[PDB]
Design a binder for this molecule. Structure first.
Ligand SMILES: *C(=O)[C@@H](NC(=O)/C(=N\OC(C)(C)C(=O)O)c1csc(N)n1)[C@H](C)NS(=O)(=O)O
Length: 361
């Protein structure tokens, strides 16, 4: 039976109540899409100290959910015939000399299968003069297409390279090409002076903290957004037909296309999918630092496989003071946006995201 807001309210309240409680979270913003209808919930505060609560306009740092944007942005550019996954990395950054790079294409970067590019850029690399040196001296652990090693410095470099052709900086392309078309008027990279009053404080050992500047920050973990906006983003990704821009639409279709298989999990652009129906255990345990962050053997699906409605699309993200999670089942038109201003364990988030959902399918 078609759940009623109050039965929906029951599940969500039932689940999140105790989470915040035991994970010691200050404020939370969660959204459920139940039969493609948005239902919003918000608990606690955005600012402990200045006693301001979690609003449906409150801005949360998305950490690595930022990557979904990067991947769709790259997909739009692909559709426009501006870039090609197969394109040599050199093509976009000729200055970047050194034979370690010759067989490394845009797919490698996008999908973290270049040869073990690190999870983060040595923050002693705080300028672009230094980002090239870094990449100039990098030493691959494995030949391309061998292992899969989640990394900011990988996809981060894709984002930055993928907008080269267009002549816009990343922030500008992002805005113009994805954010404006979708009407994400509350989704920022550089939060205006005007919006600072809606920008939550992330908590870390009781300290209020905002994500610091960082080479490739924007492209891998620097997008700020609100649960209203996150829900529209999920809605658009969960079904692209609604998208009027031809290129942005295809782009979304591209980022949810399957490029590699890493045992039961498939890799798109930013987005990671699983065949549905899915084993709670697979995704609750595959989300663990120990699997998620490990170098694993990947099976090249090339030509890529096409976005199928019976998949479990999703993406996790963290930042000092922030924990974020997004999941959606295209086929069932269900989704969930969980935004918290305190970083907590991944599989916690993911198991919570499952309890609810499970209850609504
Ligand atoms: C994305 O959320 C991403 N996070 C990072 O790369 C950073 N921190 O996360 C861990 C816990 C791994 C870290 O200490 O580095 C990060 C970037 S800016 C900031 N304040 N933290 C990770 C690696 N992927 S996720 O989707 O599994 O969280």
């Amino acid at each position: 039976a078609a759940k009623t807001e109050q039965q929906i309210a029951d599940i969500v309240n039932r689940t999140i109540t105790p989470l915040m409680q035991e994970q010691a979270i200050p404020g939370m913003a969660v959204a459920i899409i139940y039969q493609g209808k948005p239902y919003y919930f918000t608990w606690g505060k955005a600012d402990i100290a200045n006693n301001r609560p979690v609003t449906q306009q409150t801005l949360f740092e998305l950490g690595s959910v930022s990557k979904t944007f990067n991947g769709v942005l790259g997909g739009d550019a692909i559709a426009r015939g501006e870039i090609k996954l197969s394109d040599p990395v050199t093509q976009y950054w000729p200055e970047l000399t050194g034979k370690q790079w010759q067989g490394i294409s845009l797919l490698h970067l996008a999908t973290y299968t270049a040869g073990g590019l690190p999870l983060q850029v040595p923050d002693d690399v705080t300028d672009k003069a230094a980002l090239l040196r870094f990449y100039q001296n990098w030493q691959p652990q494995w030949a391309p297409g061998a292992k899969r090693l989640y990394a900011n410095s990988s996809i981060g470099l894709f984002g930055a390279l993928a907008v080269k052709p267009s002549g816009m900086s990343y922030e500008e392309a992002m805005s113009k090409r994805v954010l404006h078309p979708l009407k994400l008027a509350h989704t920022w990279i550089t939060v205006p002076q005007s919006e600072q009053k809606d920008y939550a404080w992330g908590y870390r050992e009781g300290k209020p903290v905002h994500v610091s500047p960082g080479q490739l920050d924007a492209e891998a973990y620097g997008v700020k957004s609100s649960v209203i906006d996150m829900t529209r983003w999920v809605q658009a990704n969960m079904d692209a037909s609604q998208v009027q821009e031809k290129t942005l639409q295809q782009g979304i279709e591209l980022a949810q296309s399957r490029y590699w298989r890493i045992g039961d999990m498939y890799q798109g652009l930013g987005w990671e999918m699983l065949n549905w129906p899915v084993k709670a255990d697979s995704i609750i345990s595959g989300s663990d630092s120990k699997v998620a962050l490990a170098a694993l053997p990947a099976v090249e699906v090339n030509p890529p496989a096409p976005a199928v409605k019976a998949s479990w699309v999703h993406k996790t993200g963290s930042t000092g003071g922030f924990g974020s999670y997004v999941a959606f089942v295209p086929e069932k038109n269900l989704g969930i946006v969980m935004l918290a201003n305190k970083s907590y364990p991944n599989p916690v988030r993911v198991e919570a995201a499952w309890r609810i959902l499970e209850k609504l399918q």
